[PDB]
């Protein structure tokens, strides 16, 4: 196996096609990273050549991506969060976010009180929809059955467990609280 | 929504029911409601012969 | 050193109640929204203003009742005998520009531009004598060039007191002599004062006479600048038609 530097001659436009993290010019395929040479033959010949480091220290979010987050503060009409994991991998730094009062449920309905949906200190799974404005930058959404708070935390520091679609109960003191439970 | 002169209820509803002069009032201006209109139906067409409102 | 001879003539040859020669101009720059240029005696000033615009930064620093006047001051490094270069952190420029912001927050009829900024810039190319009144008059002319409405035509002049007499339009030689200097900012129609300054000691009996001589010298500046404005407006009316 051989690795790459972000430019070299790899293949012709007839002997394959550019993939992820590559660019082409003057009929040749040129590398754009320092990772490893992977050629996904797939099916139909003409492999889509690409270079991937496979050791992601940082990765910029996209228009559509699954991210694991951590709520920082909540407001009556929005809830600022902190992106913590981009899908699976840990993130070296922390960006910022904002959950508007339209992305809680998968219907974009009225009612939907934000206060009992995203209590601070939780960890949530959400999806981006846009690159946002200068006030709110990523505009995450949870309008799905698989998205929502996944691992909550008690009032007095005890790991929580899901109990229903809309209601949660304390295991120790048997206290009832409201969340937005996501599918496991 | 009801856009009658003396009763105004839900002016942003999907379906608006109004007297005729309101339609010309919102047709003189833009009002950004003509873009999302699919059907416009008239209930009494026999006022073309009206001597003062035709 | 003699600052007033027995005959009554000053160092430069003018009497007590005599002004210097002013030579103005309207419409100096093209890119900006207003301009002016005045040379009061041997002091050369310059002023540039920018019209009501969107507030820079948009950091929620607006006033919902009036506009935001923002005036700066700068000075060329060859404006006096010695070089005397200064950084843009000196407290003399900030305090003079703060008195400028104070007098133009009172002269301009500002409750007509909600959520708007007014940027006023003044540049002094050669300073010899009263700098404050030259900057005020140059920025009044630049604001007039920009078409900004105001209650009246604010004008400023200084005065002094040597050997029992009141001077007018003091110079740098006379200023750097330890005397009771004093400056106003007058609205000619009402006689009101927008700003008052003084320094060094002076007995209370001669304050009325120094203030009156300063107000009269400001009313004398008013006529001379008024003829310049009238000639400019008649010029543009002639140009139009």
């Amino acid at each position: 196996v051989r690795y790459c530097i972000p430019g070299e001659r790899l293949c012709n436009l007839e002997e394959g096609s550019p993939g992820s993290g590559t660019y082409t010019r003057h009929g040749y395929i040129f590398s754009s990273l320092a990772g490893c040479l992977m050629k996904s033959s797939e099916n139909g010949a003409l492999p889509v050549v690409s270079v991937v480091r496979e050791t992601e220290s940082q990765l910029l979010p996209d228009v559509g991506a699954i991210v694991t987050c951590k709520v920082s503060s909540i407001n009556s009409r929005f809830a600022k969060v902190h992106i913590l994991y981009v899908g699976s991998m840990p993130l070296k730094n922390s960006f910022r976010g904002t959950i508007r009062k339209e992305d809680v449920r998968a219907t974009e309905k009225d009612k939907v009180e934000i206060y009992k949906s995203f209590r601070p200190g939780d960890i949530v799974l959400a999806k981006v929809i846009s690159l946002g404005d200068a006030q709110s930058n990523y505009l995450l959404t949870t309008a799905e059955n698989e998205l929502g708070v996944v691992v909550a935390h008690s009032e007095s520091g005890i790991q929580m467990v899901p109990i229903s679609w809309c209601e949660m109960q304390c295991p120790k003191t048997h206290t009832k609280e409201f969340r937005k439970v996501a599918r496991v | 929504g009801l856009l009658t002169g003396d009763v105004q209820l839900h002016p942003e509803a999907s379906c608006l029911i109004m007297t005729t002069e309101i339609l010309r009032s919102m047709l003189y201006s833009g009002s950004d409601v003509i873009r999302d209109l699919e059907w416009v139906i008239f209930d009494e067409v026999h006022y073309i012969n009206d001597v003062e409102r035709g | 050193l003699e600052l007033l001879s027995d005959q009554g003539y000053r160092v430069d040859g003018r009497r007590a109640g005599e002004l210097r020669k002013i030579q103005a101009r309207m419409g100096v720059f093209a890119q900006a929204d207003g301009s002016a240029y005045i040379e009061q005696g041997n002091t050369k000033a310059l002023a540039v203003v920018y019209g009501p615009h969107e507030i820079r930064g948009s950091r929620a620093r607006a006033l919902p009742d009036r506009a935001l006047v923002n005036c700066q001051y700068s000075s060329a490094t060859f404006s006096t005998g010695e070089r005397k270069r200064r950084p843009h952190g000196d407290r003399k420029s900030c305090e003079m520009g703060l008195q400028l912001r104070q007098t133009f927050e009172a002269a301009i009829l500002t409750q007509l531009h909600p959520r708007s900024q007014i940027d006023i810039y003044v540049q002094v190319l050669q300073a010899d004598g009263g700098t404050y009144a030259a900057c005020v008059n140059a920025a009044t002319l630049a604001v007039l060039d920009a078409g900004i409405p105001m209650r009246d035509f604010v004008c400023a002049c200084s005065a002094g007191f040597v050997d029992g007499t009141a001077l007018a339009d003091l110079s740098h030689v006379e200023e750097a002599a330890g005397g009771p200097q004093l400056a106003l900012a007058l609205l000619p129609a009402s006689g009101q004062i927008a700003l008052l300054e003084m320094d060094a000691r002076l007995h209370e009996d001669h304050l009325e006479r120094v203030l009156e001589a300063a107000a009269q010298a400001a009313r004398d500046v008013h006529t001379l600048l008024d003829r310049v404005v009238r000639q400019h407006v008649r010029e543009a009316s002639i140009l139009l038609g």
């Binding site: 690795y3 790459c4 530097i5 972000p6 430019g7 070299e8 993290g21 660019y23 754009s32 990273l33 320092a34 990772g35 490893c36 480091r53 496979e54 050791t55 992601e56 220290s57 940082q58 910029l60 070296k92 730094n93 960006f95 910022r96 690159l131 930058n137 | - | -």
Partner: protein
């Protein structure tokens, strides 16, 4: 003086201005030689990308931080150049210097023609370079190292940046020299530094000032600078290969 540092003497004249040993004579050499260079990538552990470049009497350390929050539709590229006080004949003021800002801008206008910022909307990259020792051509090291750091940190660029340096002899028959040293740089009349992309064959940055006024010397200075940037490339070719072989084998 400064309220955020330890205050010592108000004035301090270094002993070089009292050094009674008269300035010596540099010597002579062959102008068709290059100082051997050793390059290492991935040095620092807490930095997203880093590189350390040393050749002869030059010591420069470069580290690259990852993208952070805050021509958009495009990302910025912040830069910061700073050299160690214990470098050169005399000490330097910690607060800064106009020379540092000029070289920082001469770096910024040279590493942006390589990376493609049309892939990082609303983000920004920050690059920090430090010179531990000044023993020759410096701007030919702050370019190579800050490009190696970028390549080992996994940001997407069109190509690398390889720098060189030259100087003009002061004799009656001046001739340009390659990789000058402080003994051959403080006695020179002019200097030139080029930034060439070796594959794309495009000059990235140019800077030169001095006493050479005939437009026939600068053609050779430029083209021998291009030959230097095409001769330094293989070492940087094997350096990133070893860097990636070790990083991948570390998993």
């Amino acid at each position: 003086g400064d309220h955020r540092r330890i205050r010592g003497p108000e004035e301090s004249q270094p002993p070089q201005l009292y050094a009674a040993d008269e300035e010596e004579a540099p010597g002579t050499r062959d102008p068709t030689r290059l100082r051997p260079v050793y390059a290492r990538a991935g040095l620092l552990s807490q930095a997203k990308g880093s590189a350390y470049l040393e050749a002869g009497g030059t010591k420069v350390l470069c580290a690259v931080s990852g993208p952070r929050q805050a021509a958009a539709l495009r990302g910025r590229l912040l830069c910061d150049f700073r050299r160690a006080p214990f470098a050169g004949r005399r000490r330097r003021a910690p607060p800064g210097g106009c020379e540092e800002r000029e070289l920082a801008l001469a770096l910024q206008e040279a590493l942006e023609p390589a990376v493609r910022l049309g892939r990082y909307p609303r983000a920004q990259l920050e690059v920090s370079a430090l010179l531990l020792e000044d023993g020759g051509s410096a701007l030919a090291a702050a370019l190579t190292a800050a490009a190696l750091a970028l390549a080992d940190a996994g940001v997407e660029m069109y190509d690398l940046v390889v720098g060189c340096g030259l100087s003009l002899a002061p004799g009656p028959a001046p001739t340009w020299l390659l990789d000058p040293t402080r003994l051959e740089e403080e006695r020179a009349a002019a200097g030139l530094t080029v930034a060439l992309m070796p594959v794309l064959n495009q000059v990235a940055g140019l800077l030169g000032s001095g006493e050479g006024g005939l437009t026939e010397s600068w053609a050779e200075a430029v083209r021998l600078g291009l030959e230097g940037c095409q001769r330094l490339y293989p070492v940087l070719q094997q350096s990133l290969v070893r860097a990636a072989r070790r990083r991948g084998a570390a998993a």
